[PDB]
Design an enzyme around this catalytic site. Structure first.
Site, PDB file in Angstrom:
ATOM      1  N   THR A   1       0.844  -1.226   0.000  1.00  0.00           N
ATOM      2  CA  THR A   1       0.000   0.000   0.000  1.00  0.00           C
ATOM      3  C   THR A   1       0.861   1.251   0.000  1.00  0.00           C
ATOM      4  OG1 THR A   1      -1.846  -1.057   1.180  1.00  0.00           O
ATOM      5  CG2 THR A   1      -1.707   1.353   1.283  1.00  0.00           C
ATOM      6  N   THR A   2       0.361   2.304  -0.640  1.00  0.00           N
ATOM      7  CA  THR A   2       0.930   3.634  -0.502  1.00  0.00           C
ATOM      8  C   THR A   2      -0.210   4.615  -0.298  1.00  0.00           C
ATOM      9  OG1 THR A   2       2.010   5.451  -1.689  1.00  0.00           O
ATOM     10  CG2 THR A   2       1.045   3.698  -3.015  1.00  0.00           C
TER      11      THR A   2
END
Lengths: 203, 218, 208, 60, 193, 212, 194, 195, 194, 60, 212
Positions: free
Chosen positions: H1-2
């Site tokens: 995830t970012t």
């Protein structure tokens, strides 16, 4: 572990008088993709190809070793190496390091001197599986195997083979985190081969 | 896998399932698990697939040099001794278990060879993941037999392992070595029949080619 | 040292169409290195909803019993919606966060006119999905649905996704899984949920 | 207890993904020699040493 | 650990490395020369364990000089990178070296820029970011790099990449040494960020 | 998780008009056959039997709990009811990370429904025409499945189970030839006195050994 | 395993079971544990299956070699000593052997796991021997006849089979005498049915 | 995830990637990594999806109950403190969770970075997830407090796109949000392939 | 340690050795291993010295409590059951007991290490029991007299004392009958000097 | 092998002194109950479980 | 370091005009007394005796090397010569990290000089009027030291050593009552046939136990 560090996957489908050998152009450093243009497929000749998945350094040094042995063999014979012989020689080279094996899995594709398609694969220590339908390796190996079993049918035409293999590889990479987004497909036939590059989700 | 070995009056029957696996994923169908060692000796192994081929290849070399040099068909004891002397030094790190069977001037012999280098002359054998399922059939059905009854007992033994072992399936390879010579039955049975699924075709327009380079073999 | 779980997972696939939901699951109950049974049902129904289970069969059965008990308590006033049932399942699953249920649960059903399929992880997070596969065969079947049904990477015109076409695609995917998945079962139990009812079908898979 | 689920998803890693995997519960074509978990050759069936004193080996 | 960012233009290659020598808790130096120049055509930088890195780089330099003088081997970035790969690989499985390199220079086929990591993995690319830059500077490189960058644009891109580490990376970096290899020789630039 | 005194596997199969359950009477402490008359088949009630395998102390605890629950309840239970009860007990024990190292087979005959079920230490359970427990699951079950047990009369089913138990005695260290067979039919529940299977070993002769 | 060796009025009598196992599974139930070193020397192997086989394969050729260098009947003493060196020189090899034969008089040599070699009048080994030390101690009698010693081995190994799970099957027996070697067989049918 | 959240003069920008993975297998590509708890308070989950979603929905209930009690919107400081305390109660038990609780306390924007370790930081720019380091690089070069609304949104949209371009554990759609004094607005679900 | 209980004609006879080892050191050589639970119930302790004493201290008061609550002679079965719960409820406690007594008929109950309770006609326990399973199997006879059973226990424990290093000293014996308990003593000098 | 002798005398530690110290080859007045190293109370005298199967516990 | 079959203890003390050495003949494999006739006192020369304890295989190896050395060189050795030789052998074995799990006592007389020495598995050695090996070092040595052995004649010294070995039998698991006594004087080296000590065990008789 080290194989998942660099990631990448290979697929080789056999049609009628043609082989579709294609791979992803991603080079990994763990989660990070350090290059979008790293091809893992090597060509000794227009009829002898092989790609590696696993430790990239092992694959490259094995390529240099295989090229050395193949050139010496061709000089000693003046008859070109059969892809079965190339796969057996690669398996032998892998097994000489049985106690410190290479962390690579190698697929060997090409056309026999008879001009028939050929594909095969090996594990870290040369356990060879000669193939009639298709063969896969790498992070996306399971997705590729499942989708190829679902979609592959024998004696595909060159263009149908290309389209089916490309679709299977795209959809297997789309479900693999370490699968690349730049892809390369070598369509191999008796007349030579065609290096076709395609793109996917761009992520 | 369920590689099985049965010894009858004048020969041996070595049967195996045609399946390979790496984890929960089937890797190879119609795999040939019966390795050539000599015209009168065959070996079938379970374990590291690369170690079975190379260990059985070392025996094939030593027995081929022996027969060629001395014009004397090799003994099964010579094959087992070669395998034992090779497997034992590695302490089982070369994980290869074999069922070596053959017919010599002394008759029919069937051996069980294990990764650490132990051997055992036996009348019937089962090996691999399906050995327990197979050995149950061999225990109940084994007796003094001819090749016909030995053929069906071994095939029934493989069938039990294919049906009851997760990591066994597909076909049955059979190879009989008698005093008259060895005869093979590749895919002797197709117990693992698959469904007749139709074909599926994408439109050729479904894939776009970015750039293309053409190379010609010469 | 004690391992509280057993991986009986085969494969389950849930696909929601515009006006139908197709649920299919293999009927094999796999032990380690063996097959306990070939006719265990992985699909449970709660009223007009079908619950799909994988992973450890006992954990999934217990989760289904808890869901049925809670839904029965809730139904003292009104029928539970698929969304409320999915949220309740998520809460129940998360209550076992330190000792999770080893079961990937897929809850599917109709909220009036609209089909809904919910996919859960072992820790309870749930997503509303168009097609989801759980179990050992999930990587062998999900790409097939992404390609043929969801039409990912399909640059040209798309084959119309009708109910029979999707059912045949599901049978194709289960054939492929049973071919290359060791623990995928011998029979596939296919359900079709329509707005006003649902029906079960059975089909055969190779029995290695 | 919580299993560090999502640590690889949550951090740059300078394989705990976002969703729990069944693994939480090698590249060699290796089959099992026997169905038994980790046995591949006959057991060492001698008489095994017990008792005495391994804490004071030299107090013969 | 040690950051190094390199670019290649149409006819130039820029390599920027962190000039400070550090251990876990202390900075031993702040301007250490971590480059080797070969015939003014190939510039390669070494990183990682300083004890292993400097020994391997010295051996590489002397081997390349010997092969050029004795065997007339043409020293291009590809040849240097292959020799580095071989020397790292030979020791990898027995007595490994904890070091990695960036090799850049001009060849008959134009600029080349190679990266050899700890395991001897060799690959070429338009830009490289090794060390901690692999996790911070690839976004900046993707955003800013384009094929027709000028030399000054390349220097500024390197400066931005190392400014990302200066502002965001916890480890302290103060000095970067940039060596630009081009048809007119090798140009050295020292910057304090 | 107790692993001290272990009773070997159970075999239960249903035939044309009933259900069989069979266990050996050996109990082993390590490689020592400490007890040879430990009996692990019990009748939970009319038309149902329970056979257990695993740690004998856990077997005794589980049967004590089942007997208490059977005497407490004023309402009869069908074999399915006992299956549900035992599955709940074992799954609860597992879920409290205090598992019973015991695996159970509940067999019984309802008004017309024949139950042949298995429950393992984790609370996992299944129902099948042939259920085997322990190493029986790997040795005897593949052999038993080769026969269409549904078409067997009681005597044929008993003979088949006896052959399977003989194979278990041959090919398992932890099982003996002294077995006990429990049978359930519509109006019958029977648990025979343990009796010894006859075995043969003439396959071992090699060349000329004097038969002593 | 239950390997037994008793010296009686006119030779050596060795008894053994047939079961070989890994875990709870009997991999084979006809294994021959009386390994012939020569026509007059027999070895009862106990310990690691692979290692004890390796030793007895080497002892077979060493005892023949010296026999023809010396020009006399193979010496059970020399075979036992040759076993002791290998078992001692190689601690990694878990092997314990009973080597019994007849060169000029019947001899029994027991090589323990660490290479401890002792000469004995009767000897037992294997996992199942633990349960018949009292039975063998009370029942052994010097200078038994063949029938008396055959009963003794039959009784001792039978009671080890009935107690040791790793021991089972029919009782292989072999009497080495100056006249040769005679094999016997006590079927498990009698042992188990009793 | 970012994930990405930052404050600029015109307001506040939030952007996430919407991929979820289980090891090498990409389980989903349309996961919603933003919990909307009210018109002026949202939370950007990162880490164990079930863990962050559960506590964020548990925090969203505390905000709802607080509103009923006081007839007044909960402050971001109290909303994040409630979330921080809940995970802190399970500190050292392996809980993995990182989130930004974004919102307005009247006229003031504030982003509180909260993680499973009990940490709680208020700041003007945070990025969380595997691709956060890549996002930090793109932001560091071009992030300014004086950004116009259109510039800030494109910076957040582009910064997440670069992180997805280079990180394995991200790369679904770029969910984009803009939170102002008057509340948040879901500005798109851009597919990274169609930039 | 060697402990055994044999049920002979109208009585119970229990025998035990005295040695209490500690590694290679004999911590004591007069330990009484025949622990009295009540005037008619005796138990032989095997396992942890501390845990088995803890159990026997508890079931000592339980047998009396229930004995006087229902006004009956203390029951061996209740003592054995009472021991079984403690040994089962508390896996941390390494305890295994032979509880033998005479309430209305002689009876022997063997509580194995994990709480497995079995009624037996004869029973042996302790480390030294391993070496007399064959001797006890062949030599046991239903319905012995006191002299026969005394010889049987005397022979079995003596042969366990010889082979087992943790077993030594004189053989303490106690015969529980309807008329009470009388102790015996087979002096170690007679055993050792033999 | 070299024993890291002097690491504490060489590094700030952000006990390997410069000179090797004796017995490199607690705050309680403990003393010992027996001269034997670890022994404190009588040995656990019972027949100890051996054999069977530990890696296949549930295959009875 | 082999720890399979172990001899228990060695006691050797010097008395008036002579030296004693004594060992039991038991060899134990764990808690099992496997052999009771393993003899560990050997004659190195016409005036030297070596008694050994520890792993029996190492004892046999060491005595084999000592016998080879004795038959090889043509020059006699005094007891201190053998002490130096054995100390060198054991210390070399230890320093090659392949030690012998054996501890020995060399005793002998040369021209009215009396040697009583000990060497342990590490090559450590010492000389004293009373040297004991193994658990004897803790049990028998404190008891032996209470008697001024230097003024004992052969019979008194033998009786004292027999008492010490009886104490060892009582208080050691690995020590038996069948001992072997070796004696060396100026013109005598003697190793007796092993004989059995007479024990009492009368302390635990108590008042009301029927002695059988």
């Amino acid at each position: 572990d080290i194989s998942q560090h660099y990631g990448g996957s290979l697929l080789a489908m056999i049609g009628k008088s043609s082989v579709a050998f294609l791979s992803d152009k991603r080079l990994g450093s763990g989660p990070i993709s350090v290059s979008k243009n790293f091809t893992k497929i090597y060509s000794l000749t227009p009829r002898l190809f092989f790609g590696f998945t696993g430790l990239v350094s092992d694959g490259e040094m094995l390529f240099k070793k295989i090229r050395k042995n193949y050139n010496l063999f061709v000089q000693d014979n003046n008859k070109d190496m059969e892809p079965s012989e190339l796969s057996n020689m690669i398996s032998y080279i892998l097994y000489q390091k049985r106690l410190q094996p290479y962390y690579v899995a190698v697929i060997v594709c090409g056309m026999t001197l008879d001009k028939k398609p050929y594909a095969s694969s090996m594990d870290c220590i040369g356990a060879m599986k000669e193939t009639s339908e298709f063969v896969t390796s790498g992070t996306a190996s399971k997705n590729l195997m499942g989708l190829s079993e679902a979609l592959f049918y024998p004696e595909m035409e060159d263009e149908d083979l290309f389209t089916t293999s490309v679709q299977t590889f795209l959809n297997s990479s789309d479900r693999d985190t370490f699968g690349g987004m730049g892809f390369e497909c070598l369509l191999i036939n008796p007349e030579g081969y065609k290096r076709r590059e395609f793109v996917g989700r761009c992520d | 896998t369920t590689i099985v070995g049965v010894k009858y009056k004048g020969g041996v029957v070595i049967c195996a399932d045609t399946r390979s696996t790496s984890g929960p994923i089937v890797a190879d169908k119609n795999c040939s698990k019966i390795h050539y060692i000599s015209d009168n000796i065959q070996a079938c192994g379970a374990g590291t697939s690369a170690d079975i081929t190379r260990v059985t290849r070392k025996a094939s070399k030593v027995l081929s040099i022996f027969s060629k040099t001395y014009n004397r068909l090799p003994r099964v004891s010579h094959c087992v001794r070669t395998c034992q002397l090779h497997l034992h030094p590695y302490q089982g790190h070369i994980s290869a278990a074999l069922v070596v069977g053959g017919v010599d001037d002394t008759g029919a012999h069937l051996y069980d060879v294990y990764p650490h280098g132990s051997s055992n002359s036996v009348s019937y054998t089962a090996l691999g993941s399906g050995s327990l399922a197979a050995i149950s059939i061999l225990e109940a059905g084994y007796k003094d037999m001819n090749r016909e009854e030995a053929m069906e007992l071994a095939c029934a033994a493989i069938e039990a392992g294919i049906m009851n072992d997760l990591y066994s399936g597909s076909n049955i390879d059979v190879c009989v070595i008698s005093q008259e010579g060895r005869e093979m039955f590749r895919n002797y049975k197709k117990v693992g029949v698959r469904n007749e699924v139709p074909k599926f075709q994408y439109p050729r327009s479904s894939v776009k080619i970015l750039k293309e380079d053409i190379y010609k073999y010469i | 040292k004690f391992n509280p779980y057993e991986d009986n997972s085969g494969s389950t696939v849930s696909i929601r169409l515009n006006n139908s939901i197709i649920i299919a699951a293999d009927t094999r109950h796999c032990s380690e290195m063996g097959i306990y049974s070939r006719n265990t049902s992985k699909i449970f129904r709660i009223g007009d909803f079908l619950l799909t289970i994988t992973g450890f069969y006992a954990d999934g059965y217990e989760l289904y019993n808890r869901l049925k008990y809670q839904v029965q308590i809730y139904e003292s006033f009104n029928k539970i919606s698929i969304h409320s049932l999915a949220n309740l399942a998520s809460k129940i699953m998360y209550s076992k966060r330190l000792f999770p249920y080893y079961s990937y649960v897929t809850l599917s059903g109709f909220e009036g006119d609209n089909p809904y399929v919910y996919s859960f992880d072992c820790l309870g997070h749930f997503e509303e999905v168009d097609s989801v596969c759980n179990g050992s065969g999930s990587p062998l079947i999900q790409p097939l649905l992404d390609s043929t049904i969801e039409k990912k990477n399909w640059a040209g015109e798309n084959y119309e996704v009708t109910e029979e076409y999707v059912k045949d695609i599901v049978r194709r995917g289960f054939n492929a899984a049973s071919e290359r998945d060791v623990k995928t079962g011998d029979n596939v139990e296919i359900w079709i949920i329509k707005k006003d009812g649902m029906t079960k079908e059975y089909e055969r898979l190779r029995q290695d | 207890g919580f299993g560090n689920v999502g640590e690889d998803d949550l951090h740059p890693q300078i394989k705990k993904g976002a969703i729990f995997s069944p693994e939480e519960f090698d590249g060699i074509d290796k089959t099992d020699i026997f169905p038994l978990k980790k046995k591949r050759d006959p057991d060492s069936d001698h008489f095994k040493k017990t008792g005495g004193d391994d804490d004071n080996p030299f107090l013969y | 650990m040690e950051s190094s960012v390199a670019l290649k233009g149409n006819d130039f290659v820029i390599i920027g490395t962190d000039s400070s020598v550090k251990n876990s808790y202390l900075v031993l130096k702040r301007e250490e020369d971590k480059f080797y120049n070969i015939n003014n055509k190939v510039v390669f930088t070494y990183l990682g364990d300083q004890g292993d890195a400097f020994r391997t780089s010295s051996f590489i330099n002397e081997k390349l000089v010997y092969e050029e003088i004795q065997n007339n081997v043409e020293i291009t970035p590809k040849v240097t990178a292959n020799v580095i790969q071989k020397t790292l690989y030979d020791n990898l499985r027995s007595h490994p070296k904890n070091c990695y390199f960036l090799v850049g220079g001009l060849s008959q086929d134009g600029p080349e820029l190679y990266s050899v990591d700890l395991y001897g993995s060799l690959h070429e690319n338009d830009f490289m970011a090794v060390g901690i830059s692999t996790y911070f500077c690839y976004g900046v490189l993707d955003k800013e790099y384009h094929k027709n960058i000028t030399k000054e644009d390349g220097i500024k891109i390197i400066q931005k990449c190392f400014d990302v580490l200066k502002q965001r990376c916890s480890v302290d970096i103060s000095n970067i040494e940039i060596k630009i290899v081009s048809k007119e020789g090798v140009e050295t630039i020292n910057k304090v960020l | 998780m107790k692993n001290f005194v272990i009773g070997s596997g159970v075999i239960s199969l249903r035939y044309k008009n009933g259900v069989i359950t069979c266990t050996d009477t050996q109990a082993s402490y390590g490689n020592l056959c400490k007890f040879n008359d430990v009996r692990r088949i019990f009748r939970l009630s009319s038309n149902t039997l329970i056979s257990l395998s695993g740690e004998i102390s856990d077997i005794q605890f589980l049967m004590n709990e089942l007997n208490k629950l059977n005497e407490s309840d004023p309402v009869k239970m069908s074999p399915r009811g006992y299956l549900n009860l035992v599955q709940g007990i074992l799954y609860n024990k597992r879920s409290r990370v205090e598992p019973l190292n015991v695996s159970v087979s509940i067999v019984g005959v309802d008004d017309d429904d024949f139950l042949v079920s298995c429950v393992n230490h984790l609370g996992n359970f299944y129902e099948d025409n042939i259920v085997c427990t322990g190493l029986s699951n790997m040795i005897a079950l593949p052999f038993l499945r080769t026969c269409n047990v549904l078409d067997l009369e009681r005597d044929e089913a008993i003979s088949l189970v006896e052959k399977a138990m003989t194979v278990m005695c041959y090919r398992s260290c932890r099982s003996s030839n002294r077995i006990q067979i429990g049978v359930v039919e519509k109006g019958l529940v029977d648990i025979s006195d343990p009796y010894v299977l006859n075995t043969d070993w003439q396959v071992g002769h090699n060349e000329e050994e004097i038969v002593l | 395993t239950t390997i037994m060796a008793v010296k009686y009025a006119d030779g050596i009598l060795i008894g053994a079971d047939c079961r070989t196992s890994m875990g709870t599974y009997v991999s084979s139930r006809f294994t021959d544990k009386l390994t012939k070193i020569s026509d007059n020397i027999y070895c009862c192997r106990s310990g690691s299956a692979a290692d004890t086989q390796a030793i007895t394969q080497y002892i077979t050729e060493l005892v023949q070699r010296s026999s023809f260098i010396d020009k006399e009947i193979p010496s059970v003493k020399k075979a036992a000593m040759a076993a002791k060196d290998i078992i001692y020189r190689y601690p990694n090899m878990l092997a314990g052997l009973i080597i019994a034969g007849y060169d000029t008089k019947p001899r029994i040599f027991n090589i323990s796991l660490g290479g401890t070699m002792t000469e004995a009048e009767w000897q037992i080994g294997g996992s199942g021997s633990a349960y018949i030390y009292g039975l063998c101690d009370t029942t052994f009698k010097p200078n038994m006849n063949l029938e008396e010693a055959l009963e003794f081995v039959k009784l001792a190994v039978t009671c080890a089979i009935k107690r040791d799970n790793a021991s089972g099957g029919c009782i292989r027996m072999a009497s080495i005498t100056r006249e040769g070697v005679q094999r016997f067989f006590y079927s498990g049918d009698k042992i188990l049915n009793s | 995830t970012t994930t990405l959240a930052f404050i600029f003069q015109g307001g506040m920008v939030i952007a996430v990637d919407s991929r979820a993975s289980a090891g090498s297998y990409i389980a989903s590509q349309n996961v919603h990594k933003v919990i909307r708890v009210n018109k002026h308070l949202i939370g950007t989950m990162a880490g164990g999806a079930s863990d962050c979603y559960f506590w964020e929905k548990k925090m969203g209930l505390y905000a709802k109950l607080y509103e009923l009690k006081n007839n007044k919107r909960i402050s971001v400081s109290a909303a994040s403190m409630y979330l921080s305390n809940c995970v802190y109660s399970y500190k050292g038990q392996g809980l993995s969770l990182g989130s930004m609780v974004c919102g307005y306390d009247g006229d003031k924007p504030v982003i509180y970075y909260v993680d499973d370790a009990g940490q709680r930081l208020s700041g003007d720019l945070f990025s969380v997830g595997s691709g956060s380091t890549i996002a930090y690089g793109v932001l560091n070069e071009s992030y300014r407090f004086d950004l116009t609304k259109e510039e800030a949104l494109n910076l957040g949209k582009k910064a997440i796109w670069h992180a997805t371009h280079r990180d394995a554990y991200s790369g679904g759609n770029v969910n984009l949000y803009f939170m102002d004094k008057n509340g948040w607005e879901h500005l798109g679900t851009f597919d990274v392939d169609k930039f």
